[PDB]
């Protein structure tokens, strides 16, 4: 039944007695469901140390991973270039998923095409798909550039991207001067961030490799900035804002902030802003190149150093106080520009917030996960706040990265109870937050199912989730936030302290039971 004056959606419609009795009859009559006491027994078992030890013995099964496949990052990299169409050579199902995944995180259109390789192509390659696909794409959507990656089926069969594209130009399907950079992005190697590195190195190769004779380091007096896989709009804007405040000439290579934030003014803009082909052609003339996320920009670093002859400085991701400081001092040394008073004052205002909030942050235990560069920056900032990052999980991390993070933890008393996990998924983390309960989780939307599970054991065992990372699907507009620089540190700080205070207010809201501590002033 429905009352027209107060219509009920699925929740709480199906809580009505007639629906509740109906679901009970379906269960008892035909579902052949395990009895409830057996379900509770098994659930309680999955929260124990015994289950965790079996859980960590896995080596063939992955449950709730915290990573995606390469071509997803290759798409995000391509979208950062002006009038550029991402183009995934292979099966069209992947592109439907790529667009939907980004659609839901940014809540914006995401343009990407496929050449729709099918069963027949599995036997004789997708050369014809490339010829017709490139010509159809250029004619229909009028891009200035097409950046080609690959799905896993095209990688298994062994399609030669270089040859197929050259034949498309040779046979007259697209003009020979039309830029078509390419990169092999195998889903069964690395993760989405590896796909970002591969796509970017491919685009850099395309525009510089053969034209290195007339280049000389530093002639354009700019600094190249390579962001890497970055899903926060504010992180692109804060980097450009700080360098502009310093008067530093810079070149952001792959800049999707405009195309992922077009205005709703009556017209759909498929393309917007982005790095120009001219900026890529001229990049070798920069003073140097800074890699914002070096732990998944390995391939790009080798090319920038090997071919452009730039001496990429050893810099951590500019997150937190120390690493933002070092980033600015290195930019100052390279450009010859002093750090302006405005950034000095902004730094002091972040420190002021740290002093004002340090009593609520001290000792708070956190589990967290994400991509390698983002995680260690988050770990670094937590230690600076006096927090304990007890559970550090990076599904797509490697041994060399874990060694670095372990050194960061050892250099602080707040890293004493911390452990770094690589190759583990969110079902591994579920066990960790049960057997070694932290105070909060910091992670993407998939963590909400770990919070649900902890609450089922008990209110005193619930581990609330703080959404910082990718993807974020169940809140709106957090993709506009910032995590880099002093600005990002202030936003993270504010989110952490107020999550602690919100949780405290809830636990002290019971009248005449716990509301003695329901303070007005905190």
């Amino acid at each position: 039944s429905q009352q027209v004056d107060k219509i009920k959606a699925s929740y709480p419609l199906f809580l009505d007695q007639d629906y509740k009795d109906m679901l009970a009859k379906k269960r008892d009559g035909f579902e052949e469901k395990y009895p409830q006491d057996k379900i509770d027994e098994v659930f309680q078992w999955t929260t124990t140390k015994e289950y965790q030890e079996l859980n960590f013995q896995r080596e063939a099964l992955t449950v709730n991973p915290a990573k995606a496949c390469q071509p997803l990052g290759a798409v995000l990299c391509a979208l950062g270039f002006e009038k550029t169409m991402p183009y995934v050579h292979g099966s069209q199902g992947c592109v439907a998923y790529f667009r939907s995944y980004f659609n839901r995180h940014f809540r914006e259109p995401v343009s990407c095409v496929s050449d729709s390789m099918t069963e027949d192509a599995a036997v004789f390659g997708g050369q014809q798909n490339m010829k017709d696909g490139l010509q159809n794409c250029k004619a229909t959507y009028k891009p200035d550039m097409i950046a080609v990656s690959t799905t896993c089926m095209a990688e298994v069969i062994g399609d030669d991207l270089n040859a197929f594209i050259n034949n498309s130009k040779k046979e007259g399907f697209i003009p020979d001067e039309f830029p078509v950079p390419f990169a092999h992005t195998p889903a069964f190697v690395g993760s989405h961030v590896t796909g970002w590195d591969n796509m970017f190195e491919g685009i850099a190769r395309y525009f510089t490799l053969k034209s290195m004779d007339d280049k000389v380091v530093g002639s354009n007096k700019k600094i190249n900035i390579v962001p890497g896989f970055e899903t926060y709009l504010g992180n692109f804007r804060v980097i450009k804002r700080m360098l502009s405040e310093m008067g530093v000439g810079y070149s952001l290579l792959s800049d999707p902030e405009e195309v992922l934030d077009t205005p709703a003014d009556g017209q759909f803009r498929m393309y917007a802003g982005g790095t120009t082909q001219e900026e890529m052609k001229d990049a070798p003339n920069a003073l140097n190149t800074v890699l914002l996320q070096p732990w998944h920009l390995e391939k790009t670093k080798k090319f920038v150093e090997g071919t452009w002859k730039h001496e990429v400085p050893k810099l951590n991701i500019p997150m937190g106080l120390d690493w933002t400081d070092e980033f600015l001092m290195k930019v100052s040394e390279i450009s010859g520009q002093p750090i302006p008073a405005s950034l000095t004052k902004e730094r002091g205002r972040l420190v002021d917030m740290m002093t004002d909030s340090h009593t609520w942050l001290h000792g708070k235990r956190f589990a967290l996960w994400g991509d390698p560069d983002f995680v260690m920056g988050l770990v670094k900032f937590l230690l600076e706040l006096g927090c304990e990052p007890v559970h550090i999980l990076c599904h797509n991390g490697n041994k060399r990265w874990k060694k670095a993070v372990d050194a960061i933890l050892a250099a602080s008393p707040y890293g004493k109870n911390a452990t770094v996990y690589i190759g583990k998924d969110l079902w591994h983390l579920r066990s960790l937050v049960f057997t070694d309960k932290p105070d909060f989780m910091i992670g993407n939307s998939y963590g909400k199912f770990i919070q649900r599970d902890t609450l089922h054991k008990g209110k005193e065992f619930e581990v609330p989730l703080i959404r910082i990372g990718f993807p974020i699907f169940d809140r709106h507009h957090l993709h506009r936030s910032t995590t880099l620089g002093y600005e990002g540190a202030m936003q993270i700080l504010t989110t952490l302290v107020n999550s602690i205070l919100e949780r405290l207010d809830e636990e002290t809201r019971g009248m005449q039971a716990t509301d003695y501590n329901h303070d007005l002033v905190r």
């Binding site: 039944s1 429905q2 027209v4 219509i7 699925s10 419609l13 629906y19 109906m22 679901l23 009559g29 035909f30 579902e31 052949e32 379900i39 098994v42 659930f43 999955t46 289950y51 859980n55 063939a60 099964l61 991973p65 995606a68 496949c69 183009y87 099966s91 069209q92 199902g93 992947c94 439907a96 998923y97 667009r99 659609n103 809540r107 914006e108 259109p109 095409v113 496929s114 050449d115 729709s116 069963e119 192509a121 017709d132 696909g133 159809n136 794409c137 229909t140 959507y141 896993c152 089926m153 069969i157 889903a187 190697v189 709703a264 003014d265 009556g266 017209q267 759909f268 803009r269 199912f449």
Partner: protein, 475 residues
Amino acid sequence: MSREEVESLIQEVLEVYPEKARKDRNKHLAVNDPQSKKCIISNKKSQPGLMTIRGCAYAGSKGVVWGPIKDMIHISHGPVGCGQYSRAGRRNYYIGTTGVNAFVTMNFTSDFQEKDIVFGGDKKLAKLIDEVETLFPLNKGISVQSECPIGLIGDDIESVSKVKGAELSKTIVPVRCEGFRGVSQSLGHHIANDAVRDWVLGKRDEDTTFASTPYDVAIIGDYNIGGDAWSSRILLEEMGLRCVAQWSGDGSISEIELTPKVKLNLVHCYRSMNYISRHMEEKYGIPWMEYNFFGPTKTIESLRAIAAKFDESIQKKCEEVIAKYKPEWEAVVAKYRPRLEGKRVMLYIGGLRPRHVIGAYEDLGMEVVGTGYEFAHNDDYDRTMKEMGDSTLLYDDVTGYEFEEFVKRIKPDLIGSGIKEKFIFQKMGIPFREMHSWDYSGPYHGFDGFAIFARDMDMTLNNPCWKKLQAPWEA
């Protein structure tokens, strides 16, 4: 508007294509004359590089048919991508304890690495099954959903399924739904249907222990999006029928095994489940009928048609249900129809809803001036021409460029489509409702769902945001 105007609209849009693409797309764009094959073809390969909306066979098998089965564990066999982008993306609701006895919103995968590509993953799959049994003892079956590389590298998941299934006395279903197969999600439905037939549906061919009644039915092809199936089940059981099974929203493996015992199969989504419906009529003799629970007019029509398959007692309870909910949906129309009367709609969805929801819009005085399917067949378009008005635009496997150009000229009041289209038309200032996920609302089936549907169209179509697109100083 007029028939010639829309035909000339088609011609102008196709002018941008190369010759080859132009000649193919012309066969997929037509104006309705209410013999579908006589004016539009479908179920063809997508032209490369035109930004199709379609997915793959894995999506049609894993995401649509098998995924919703709650007490089974479904393995995304291959690299890590497919299972992650499809995790909890579809709102096929269910009752259960996730991680203990239900697993719908979880992502199980073999996470293929390079060593698995060059030496196969059959040994890894056997290990994976053993690990599943250890950590999820209450699972009542396992399905292995094949991703693209599995078929290309020559793996034999059927041999693993049979060996491990006998070793553990377990139902293990191999599904060769690799994404390169077929042309869309459509073939994934068929592949999944054949997997149910060959590995599950016959498990109780010999058993007679289930007590049958003359009013046993089965809901086939309702995936309980936002509770759609629960809103449909309650009506059928108020009519005096006993719903034995739900395929596959909130469906359990036992419900599937009991389906050959029912007296009538009620098929909602023809496209995705007609294969198994025709099988059950040949092997078990169970007849099936299509029905439509979108809107009061269709719901009432379907209840009466279903009740006519039984005796006078069900027909009597049928009119009781119709009389009970009559004041409810009449109040909905009285409130919302004057707010939506005359508004024009364009639809682009998958394989059923582009026609099934027309009656619901017409129950609110709205007109569907254009509809289309991602992956329907000719038999779906046959059924569409009776529903759509005359001189309305039909498009098969529409391209991103075509859809935008059609909207620019037709200028509908509302667009109902998918997430990959939503934010495009919102920026153009056209109200948009997601017609796959219900925009995280619903249910829309049945009488209770119609109230939500009308509330949802109205809140979006008449929202104050749509008048503010233009800044006052740029006019």
